[PDB]
Each structure stands twice: as C-alpha cells, then as structure tokens.
Amino acid sequence: QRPERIKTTPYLEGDVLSSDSGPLLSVFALQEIMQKVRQVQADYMTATREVDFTVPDVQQILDDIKALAAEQVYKIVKVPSTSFRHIVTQSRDRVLRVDTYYEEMSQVGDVITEDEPEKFYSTIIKKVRFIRGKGSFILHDIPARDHRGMEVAEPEVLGVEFKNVLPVLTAEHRAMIQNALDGSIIENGNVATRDVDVFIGACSEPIYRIYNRLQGYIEAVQLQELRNSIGWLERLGQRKRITYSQEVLTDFRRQDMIWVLALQLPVNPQVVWDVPRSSIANLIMNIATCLPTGEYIAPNPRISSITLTQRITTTGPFAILTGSTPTAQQLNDVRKIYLALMFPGQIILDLKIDPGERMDPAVRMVAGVVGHLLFTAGGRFTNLTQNMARQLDIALNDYLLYMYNTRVQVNYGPTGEPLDFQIGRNQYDCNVFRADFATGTGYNGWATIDVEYRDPAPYVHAQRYIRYCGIDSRELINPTTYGIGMTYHCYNEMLRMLVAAGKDSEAAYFRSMLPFHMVRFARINQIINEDLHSVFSLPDDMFNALLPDLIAGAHQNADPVVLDVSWISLWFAFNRSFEPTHRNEMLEIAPLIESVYASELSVMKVDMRHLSLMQRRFPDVLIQARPSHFWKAVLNDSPEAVKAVMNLSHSHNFINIRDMMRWVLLPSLQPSLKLVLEEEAWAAANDFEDLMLTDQVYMHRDMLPEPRLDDIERFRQEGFYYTNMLEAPPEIDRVVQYTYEIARLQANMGQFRAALRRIMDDDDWVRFGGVLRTVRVKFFDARPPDDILQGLPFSYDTIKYATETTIFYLIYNVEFSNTPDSLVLINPTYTMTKVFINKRIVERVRVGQILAVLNRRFVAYKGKMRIMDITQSLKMGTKLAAPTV
C-alpha cells in the first residue's frame, strides 16, 4: 500500500506543516510570475503594448482538452449527399446536369479582395475544412431492395436528383433509366454474413477522395496500432511505478466491432517543444499534470532538545527556530524554493527585499549555511542566480567571521573577495566555499554526480535522471551504506569548516539533521525523474544548455524563471521535507491529453504552412500580406483549449513574425486521424478551381445568340442555353494579358477604358491574371440583368480589380406563337465577361445518359455492425495479455 512510505523509525515521523498538489502549484507558479511583471512595469517607467497578465484556470483548460478526445471527425450516414442534380430545359430529349459540389463550394467563404488578406486566408481554410467535412462518410446500413434474385441499392443511396426529369420522359427513356436503377446491384448480394455492401452510386470527385482516404485509415489502423500505443503506456507505467489492475487487454475483436482509433500514443516530443515561447506554459503543464499531492513534514523535536530530567533539557543553538511562518507572504515563498529545485535549472532563485520588515541579522548566517547545503550551484545545472549566490557567500563569510565565543586564527587572503581567509587552528580554506558555477565548489554536489544518464527513457526528450547529492531513491527502499554515515561531500566539508572556525554546537545540529536532509532529497529525486517526467518535462539539450548559456547570457529560448525568495524561508525550507501522498488524478490520462495537444498543434502548422506559400503562389492577390495574418486566421478556426495552453505564458503578444515563420517551417509533426484527413482534403484543395476561384477571366464583346425559329418542335435541341463559361480558352496569341499593376496604371491615368474598348473593337481577348475572384453560377429563364450580361470584372468609382464574377447559363424558351425572325433585333445585345474552369460543372446531357454519373465505387458497413472509436481507452493503468515488444 505504502511502498517506500514505510516509516521504520520515529526519526522520520514528524509533524505536518502544509500540503500542495499539481493544480495548486501550477496556478501559484503563474500567479507569482504575473505579479512579478506588474509590480515592475507598474512600478517603473514602462513603455510597451498593454497586456493583461491574467492567471487562467488550469483545471478547466485541462478538462476541456480531455473533452476533445470525444469529438470525432467521421460522420456516419445511411445515404451519401446528392452530388448531382438535373435542371430541365424546354427540350424533352436533353437536360443539363450540375455537380452540386461546385455550387456549394461557390458560396463557402467571403468574396475575395486584394484589400483584406486576412479575409482571404480564412476564406480558404473554411473552404478546405468544408471539403474535409463533406468527405468524412461511413455509410452504415443502406436501403437494400430485393429484385429478381438480386439485392440492389435504392435510388436514394445513389448520387442523383432525377425525379425532375421523369415526367418528361419518353416511354423508351423511362425504361432505360429504370434498368440502370435496378441495374446497380449490391455486388456480393446473395451471401449473408457479408459485413459490407458494395454498390455503384455517383459522387463528386474531391469528396470521393476524402471518403476513400478515410475508409483506408479505418481498415489499416487496427489492433496492432492500438497494441503498440498501449504497450508504450504499459512501459511508462513501470517507469512511474504504477499500481496495476488485475485485468488484461484481450485483443479479441468482436465481429460487430470495427474500431476507430484517432491518435497514436508514442507522442513526438518535438511538436510540443517546437511551439515558440512555450517553455513556461510547458513547464506549468508538467506541474499541473504530473506533480503529485503531498505534505511537508517537520523533523523530530527530539533531534534538537532532549530531556534528561524534568529540570534538565538540551537547547538547540537555534532557538530562533520557533518562528511561526512569516505568513503565506513567505510560506508561499518556501513553496517557491521547493518547486524551484524540483525543476532543475528551469526555475532560478533570487533574494527579494522589502525594505520594511526588520529581521535579526542572524537569519542571514543560518541562511548562508543552509543555502550552501540545500541548493545546487553545481557545475552540472544550477539552482540560483549569480548574484543570489554571492549574497549567500557574503552571508556565510560575514558569519564564519562572527565569533560569539573565543576567536580563532583567521588568516586572510590577498583578495578582498569574501571567503579568502583560513579560519581554524588547522587553517582550512574557506575559499573552497566560494562560488564557481563551472565547478559548484561551494554549494551542493560539488564533488558529486547529479545528472545520471542511464537506461533508455520512456519519454526520449529527457533520458537524464537527477540524483541530488548522489542519493538514488533506492537507498530508501533498501539502504546503501548504514545510517551513521550518509554524508555527501559538501555537507561534510561544511561541518569541518563550522568546527574549525566558529563552533561545534551548531555543527552538531547539522550533523544530526543530515539524514532528514538527505531523505527529503531522495524523495525529491524520486518525484523528479520518476513521478513527473512528461512531454513537458524538457529535453536534455536545453537542460545542459542552461548553465553555460546563463553564464554567457546567451538568449536561451527557455529563459529560466527567476523567483524571488526571503532570507527566512531558507530556514523553513530546510526544516520541512515534503513527503508525497497521492499521485494527481491527471497522471493516468496525461499521455492522452498530450497526444491531443500535439496532434491538434501540428494540424495548425500544416494549414499555416500552405498558407504562407499562398503569397508566392499569387503575389498580386495579397500584396499587403504578413504571416501573422494567416497564422491568426488559422488560430481562429482551431480549438480554444489548445490555444490557451499556448497562451498560458501570454506568448501570443510577443511571438514575432520571424518566430512564427520558423515554427511553420519546422518539420516535426504528430499524426492523427484529423491530420491525415486535413492534409488529404488540403491536397485536393491545391487545384483552386476545386475551390471555385480562377485566374481565367476574360472579356470579349459578344452577341446574344438570337436564332431563327423555323421548326419550334426542333427546339427540343439543347434549349439553346448560352453561358459565359468557355468550352475552352481562346488561342493564347489572340489574348492581351493584363496585370494588376498594368491595369492600375492605365486606369489612374484614365486610359484604361479607351485601351479596353480598342481591344474589344478589334475582336480581341483580354485576360485579367494575377487575381483570383470568387466565382458564382446562376441560371436564367430569360434576359438577365444588364449588370450581369454587361457586367465587368472590376469597379470604376482608381481601378479596383477582382470582384465576383458570375457565370450564368441562359436558357432559351419559346412558344408556338413565335415567328422565325421574331427573335431578331435591329441591334445586337452584348456580353463581355467570360470565364474558364476546365471542370465539368454544368454539362449538356442526353437523357438516357443521365444515369451515367454512377461510376464511383462505394463500400458500406452492413447494418449488423457497430462502429466504435477506441480512442479514449488510452489510460495508463491498462495492461495487455499479449506483452508486445
């Protein structure tokens, strides 16, 4: 029940002081850092954009992320979206099909303008997103009808709207189509068992693409993937010494259940640490997730004073140690200390001075010593600030030199620098307890190894595992070398000095305290490299970089947080030990949360990536650009929780254009179902015509086709539709190419019209390249609005490019009262704008040809089966019966 918590002797059983937890400290941390800044900026002359350093709710943000595992991308339907529609002309032999997709796509984002680039970006995203959504199909349970020994699909599961047409059909055409309908069968049909139904139904290409990629995933990603990921946790379980269940995972898959895993477990360390200015946020996350709950223990009162007689008792040299904790004002100030060493060189310590509260200078002595044997300024990593250390050496020095008893021989050194002397009747340098950061000669692990790389780590950012004073937690489980001598070098030398110089009376206190001290440290180690190494842990790279970079004052992206303490607190921190109680509940689900974060993260990166290229793809569309724009629009359409994790440190108001560019260009990604879909849908997006915005926009003075009506019944022709959408572009040599700039200039000079007119008169063409334009498709029964026929691809109020560009389809309808020439006018009606897409949006069809659309594959899970997403079953305490590698 209590593995190492087993208290053998009363010596460890002290009183209870306070207690902390993950969510407790995580908040406190932020708070302290935020006060820091206000208190300085608000205090001194400050000049910068205003930021509201708020301490957000860590729990609720976390809980919101855990809520994401639920949100599924795939959507289960029983019938596919329409895809195709038929619009009837006066004709009875011909109709026109429309690819619904294109219409919907037509009206997705806002109109495109060279003015708002941000508008543009989101407009694209929305469009891409649209595709991805329109593609996440499943097709469970289909309307299988029986017909002549075969099971066929009901016209509802196909991809067409033809009901409109039916009434105008020739007995012949009707029949043909009927056969086509009961034509598409369920392939396997007569088999029972089955599991899946295969039919033929029609579908818009881009959408199909997604459906397929998805379908593949769900069939590729099964047991094994799941198996691995769980095994990973199963492995991390051992590193964190998890209490295990009596259950096991049978890789038994029911014939009903098709699994849908959305996130794999071994998470890519980098995606988390790639996020610019993450350091703080990450750290806090590390706390809030992995930092367990525990209580601070006091030593035994018997360690100092002991009763010999009702009248005779010993007195500890530090009677001052009866001071009741300097409010939370300083109690919290102790929490800083603990938390600081619990996070290697990630958090540094510094003095802090309220010119008020008058303390007895003795506090400095004690703290001078204490600081030296409880903080690690070891040349491996360091806990304290450069000046912080000096003050402790001066505290030490000042006090080695304060002799309340008979004075000893102090043989000073040539340097005025503190600790040059050699107090002791046997000399002994005090120069040793100086303060070299590259050596760590004064404070902790001065002659010790505290960074022990060893064993392959379940995480991989950090393979290191910290040994404060070279005490492995194991020494608790089973001792290493007696109880008499536990002494590590420094604490030992400290004693020797205290003796030689001042006095034993105090050195005795520390002598007896020693075990309590090391125990506290052993536990600390355990907690660090065992209980809390998560993704947010921090790579050894940056760790090792900290110390030297601190000395040179580089620009460590992971600038350590400098916390300010209180002289008093050291005493208090020294006399409290912290003993963990329960591991925070967040722990067992931690990895999952991590996966969610990381994967959602990468997805954004992907989006942003392609958007940066946009500027280079069509430099004319977005002149006024800036990366912040897209990354802002991306951040916009992505999940709050994630964004908040990034903004814990309030980084968003600091990340410079360059910083973000680097992150986009960084190439570490975390795969997820969402990821692959987004990327795939994203890929199809590269077409642009599939987005409904083209460069192919021309002008060419054209007559409105006024035909001769000699055989009205012969207008069963294609009802003579018109349309400005070009069958194919004009001969490239006959086209005058125009640029944003060219048009702009000519217009500003007031020559644009003239030139344009001339071109029109010469029966030549003119293309307006560079800009995209949203394209819309409208259909008409008769003579549409002039602002449409003679509509132009720009405003004239300076020449404003782009605009909407309407592709119309004018259907000619006529009654028997129409004279052959009745359609002619003394003067022609002109149409200028024309567009080209090389995508069969609206197409003239026969009638019997209507059903040709079918084409597409289609696999639909039989009604019998149950699709379940095994994504939230990634808890840590789950063991499998089939061990895996």
Binding site: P456, P883, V885
Partner: protein, 349 residues
Amino acid sequence: MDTIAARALTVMRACATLQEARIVLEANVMEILGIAINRYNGLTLRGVTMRPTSLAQRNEMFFMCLDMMLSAAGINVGPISPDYTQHMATIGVLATPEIPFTTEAANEIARVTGETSTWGPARQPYGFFLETEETFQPGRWFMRAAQAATAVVCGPDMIQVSLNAGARGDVQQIFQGRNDPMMIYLVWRRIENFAMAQGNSQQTQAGVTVSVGGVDMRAGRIIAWDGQAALHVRNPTQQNAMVQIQVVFYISMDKTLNQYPALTAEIFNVYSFRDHTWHGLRTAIRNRTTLPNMLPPIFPPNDRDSILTLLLLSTLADVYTVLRPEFAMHGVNPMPGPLTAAIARAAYV
C-alpha cells in the same frame, strides 16, 4: 553486440538452472528469465513458460535458447526441422537494453572479444621441425661435401650437427625460414657415441662449445634463444664430434587452445554425441560455420565468431542436457536402444 551474446548466454545458463522441479528459483534468476521470456513471447508469439514441465513446454524453452544462441552467433540454419522454425527477430529481443546479463556472462564474453581481437605469446603445440620433408638417422654422421660443420634434422624437435676436428661454424639458418617464432628454448647435448659413415662407433670429446650471440652456453641447460642471435658451434677437439640441439618448445603469436580458459573441454562438449537429435542438430549448425561439422578442428580457431559460436553451442548443449527436449530433424533417425559407444562411433560419418 557483445552485449547481445552476453544476454543470450545468461538466458541459456539460467535455463540450465531449471533442473527437475523440487527447485526454489534463485530470486535473481526469476527476474531475468521473466523479462526475457516475456519479451521473447512478445516477439515469438510462442508460449514459453518460466517453469516448464510437460515436454512441449520444455521444447518451447529450448527452442527459445536455440533461437537466441543462433542469433547471437549470427547463424541462419534454415529449414532443418518440421518441429522447429527459426525466428530472425530473436536478434531484436537481444538488442533491447531491457534484458540484463550476469557478471559471469559479461566477463566470459569480454575475455573472448578481448583476446580474439589482438595477439599474444603462446607455447606452441607441436615440435619445431614438424613440417619438414626430409629427416636423417639420429646419431649417424653426415657431412655435406665441402663443409666443416653440417647441421641437419633428425626428428620433429631434433637437429644434430656434424663437426670435423678443429671445425666451427654458425647454425641458426637451419631454424630460420618457418615464419615467426618469438623465442625458441634450446638444450644441446654431446652425442658421446655416434655412428660413422661406415658404421663404426665414434666418441665426441669433452671440449666442444656452443655459443649464442657470442656468449658460451652449457650443455643440458635451457636457453632463451631469440632466433636471430648467432648460434655458433666450435670443435677445438682433435676428433670428430656430433652434438644434438633440441627445441624443447617455442612461443609464437599463433592462437593455441589456451587462448580462452579450458576451451578444450568446451569443444569436447560441443563435439560430444549425446544422442542423434543433438548430434544432427550440432552438425547442421556448424555447417553454416567455418568449423568442422563433427570432428575437432586440427588448428585452434582465431576469430571472435568461431570461439564465440563454440561457447554458445557448448552451453546450449548443457541446456539440451537439462531440458531433455524431444523433436525431429530432416535426415535424422533416432535409434531408441539404450545407446552404446558403438552406436555413437557409427554416427560420425
């Protein structure tokens, strides 16, 4: 890489501990096997017990050791049995730092790799002049035409010089030629009674001296001869003389059977019969190697792989002994009779 072998060794040596149930496992052992067996089963998908008993349970365990032993030796035996199949993945289990190994195994390997990778001085096995095409009768006089001193071979480690009265000369050249000796240990004697060209007895008078590099050396004493120094024989006596110089032994940097502690016994153990199953197995395994499939190599190997393979096979032999596995092999036909030296003899080709 050596680590891999150390693991595979530890595992086998551990399995050998599993004699016949009545055992309380050495706590340490349990831990190791468990980790290994676990990982192995996770890659083999086979059902290996930590404490086998049935037979099929035992076979499985043996097969494991086999798979590991082969993988550690880098051998691919191929289709040799219907009952067993080699899983190449066995290497990945052995490469995983998650499986420990004994200090015993670690040093055992370290020694093999250590010596095998370098050279050293070692007392050679046979007589110096063993690879000689011609030999002369011992004690019989022989003087090559125009020579005052004629040294010649009379045995594997024996030479005798024929000196005329008052004659002298260097002899070292008879020794040189055989690639590389580091220090030859000699001992010369006077042939007090030798045969003449005709057959009559002849005496060698006291006074004949032998000096190496100049310094004069006694008869019947061992001499640290560097093979390069001048081997000078003088005959101040007024009679014919014949002295025998004996190469008691010499040292060279060639690998002997003492390169690795009691290697001999191991090899013996490897080449030993046991039964047809073991025999045929061990045979089939070495067929992949440079080693003689069933007869002790004349010349002690000198490469890591060879020595290694032998050790592994030797241990795997003992495993076979404790486990008593029973399975088939292509071309092997088990004779159930009690088994005699006779039946064994016949098995070796």
